[PDB]
Amino acid sequence: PKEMLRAQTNVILLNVLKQGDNYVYGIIKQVKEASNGEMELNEATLYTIFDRLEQDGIISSYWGDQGGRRKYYRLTEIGHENCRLAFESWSRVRKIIENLEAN
Known part of the structure; x- marks a missing residue:
C-alpha cells in the first residue's frame, strides 16, 4: 500500500540517520542486512525522499x-527534536488507547 510503504520507508531512513551520518549506498546496505534481505531499496527512491x-x-x-x-x-x-516531539505526542496517544480499553 504505496503511501504506507512510503511512510514506512521514511521511518526506517530517519532511524538509520538517527543512528548516525551515512551515505546512500551504505544506508541501502544496512537496510538490506537489517531486514535480513527482504527490503532492498533502490537509490532513486532514497533520492526523492x-x-x-x-x-x-x-x-x-x-x-x-x-x-x-x-x-x-x-x-x-x-x-532530532521532531523525533522527540513525535514520540512524546504519540505515547500520549498510546496511553489514551490503553485507557479506553479499561473503561
Whole structure:
C-alpha cells in the first residue's frame, strides 16, 4: 500500500540517520542486512525522499573527506527534536488507547 510503504520507508531512513551520518549506498546496505534481505531499496527512491527531507530541513548533507568524496547525510537538530516531539505526542496517544480499553 504505496503511501504506507512510503511512510514506512521514511521511518526506517530517519532511524538509520538517527543512528548516525551515512551515505546512500551504505544506508541501502544496512537496510538490506537489517531486514535480513527482504527490503532492498533502490537509490532513486532514497533520492526523492532525501530531496524532500533536506528542502524541509530535516536532513543536511556534506562531502566526506579513500578516493572520495562520499556525500554524507545527517539528521539535523530539527529532525532530532521532531523525533522527540513525535514520540512524546504519540505515547500520549498510546496511553489514551490503553485507557479506553479499561473503561
